[PDB]
Amino acid sequence: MASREEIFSKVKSIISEKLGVDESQVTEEAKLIDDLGADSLDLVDLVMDFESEFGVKVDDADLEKISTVGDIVSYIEKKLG
């Protein structure tokens, strides 16, 4: 079943494994590009990984609305319903 823990944990799994960074750098208010150093290319791959992982499609506009991990987490929780 859907759960916030599932979102955050899975989200960290993609970002952490591809960047080699611990969730300490990951924050609901931390920016993936500034706080972690993941540029637009990095961001596309990370969100994409969630796109297939959660079996959901994302809006290019949603990407613009998503900057921090908080947005990533909140996005999946609401997008799935």
From Swiss-Prot:
GO terms for cellular component: cytosol; membrane. Residues 5-80 form the Carrier domain. Keywords: Cytoplasm, Fatty acid biosynthesis, Fatty acid metabolism, Lipid biosynthesis, Lipid metabolism, Phosphopantetheine, Phosphoprotein. It is found in: Cytoplasm. GO terms for molecular function: acyl binding; acyl carrier activity. 4'-phosphopantetheine is transferred from CoA to a specific serine of apo-ACP by AcpS. This modification is essential for activity because fatty acids are bound in thioester linkage to the sulfhydryl of the prosthetic group. The keyword DNA-binding does not apply. Pathway: Lipid metabolism; fatty acid biosynthesis. InterPro entries: ACP, ACP-like_sf, PP-bd_ACP, Ppantetheine_attach_site. One of its GO terms (biological process) is lipid A biosynthetic process. It holds the Pfam family PP-binding. Carrier of the growing fatty acid chain in fatty acid biosynthesis. This is Acyl carrier protein. It comes from Thermotoga maritima (strain ATCC 43589 / DSM 3109 / JCM 10099 / NBRC 100826 / MSB8).
